[PDB]
């Protein structure tokens, strides 16, 4: 696959509908902990242990401590130059009547904080809740999300469970509900929102240029989306830190931090 920035820029200059698939690497360049992969732990657990319906069923306080920590951590994190290049791209192209959409698995909203408006968050958001009784989804940026979680969620091994009674965990504020809230994030073993998948398909079907950023095109989630773009003859450009593009078929591979390559690519 080509590494010619000048050739990519020629496609970019003509593209009227860009899909940008954004993976964990974009968030990692902002220092956002993912609690996945080697070394990434919260206390003695990884996300595979806590981001599950079973974990929440048995230990909702521990799961809420985990997500509370991750919410509060965001107060010290900022979008990186990759987020900014992507947002600035959307803004500039939008004034020209050209579409940019970001499809991200990241749940930390740094794309939104950078100014991205056209955003499909396929794994949901740390800053949305869903009521386990009535289903309502709500924005929630409160620090702390409930009083009982103030000062909880410390990540250090040895930290004991807060063991907050479920009545004092975040509760639904719809009139006449009061049900127990969960984070509006996709957990292991769960379905994506079919409505989001429908929106994703529409974008993949109409785009004339696809970028895969901060992840590989041959693993989830990009592997679910990029192949059918490439099948239509649409160029796919990969921006990630792998030395070997674990793939041919795709037109471009640019190695490096997205905050180094994307400002130039999307200028």
């Amino acid at each position: 696959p080509s590494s010619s920035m000048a050739d990519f820029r020629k496609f970019f200059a003509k593209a009227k509908h860009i899909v940008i698939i954004s993976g964990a690497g974009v968030s990692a360049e902002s220092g956002v902990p993912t609690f996945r992969g080697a070394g990434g732990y919260w206390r003695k657990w990884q996300a595979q242990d806590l981001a599950t319906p079973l974990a929440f069923a048995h230990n909702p306080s521990r799961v809420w401590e985990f997500y509370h920590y991750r919410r509060e951590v965001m107060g010290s994190k900022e979008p990186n130059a990759g987020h900014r290049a992507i947002a600035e791209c959307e803004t500039r192209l939008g004034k020209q009547g050209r579409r940019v959409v970001v499809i991200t698995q990241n749940i930390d909203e740094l794309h939104r904080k950078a100014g991205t408006k056209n955003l499909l968050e396929i794994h949901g958001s740390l800053f949305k809740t869903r009521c386990t009784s009535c289903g309502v989804v709500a924005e929630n940026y409160k620090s702390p999300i409930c009083p009982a979680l103030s000062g909880k969620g410390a990540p250090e091994p040895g930290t004991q469970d807060a063991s907050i009674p479920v009545e004092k965990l975040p509760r639904c504020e719809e009139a006449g509900c009061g049900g127990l809230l969960r984070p509006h994030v996709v957990w292991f073993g769960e379905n994506l929102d079919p409505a989001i998948l429908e929106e994703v398909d529409r974008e993949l079907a109409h785009c004339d240029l696809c970028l895969v950023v901060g992840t590989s095109s041959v693993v989830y989630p990009a592997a679910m989306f990029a192949p059918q773009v490439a099948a239509r003859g649409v160029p796919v450009a990969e921006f990630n830190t792998e030395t070997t593009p674990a793939t041919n078929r795709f037109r471009f591979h640019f190695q490096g931090p997205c905050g180094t390559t994307l400002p130039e690519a999307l200028a």
């Binding site: 595979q48 242990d49 599950t52 698995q105 794994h123 996709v186 292991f188 073993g189 989830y220």
Partner: peptide, 4 residues
């Protein structure tokens, strides 16, 4: 617990 898996890969999403």
């Amino acid at each position: 617990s898996l890969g999403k």
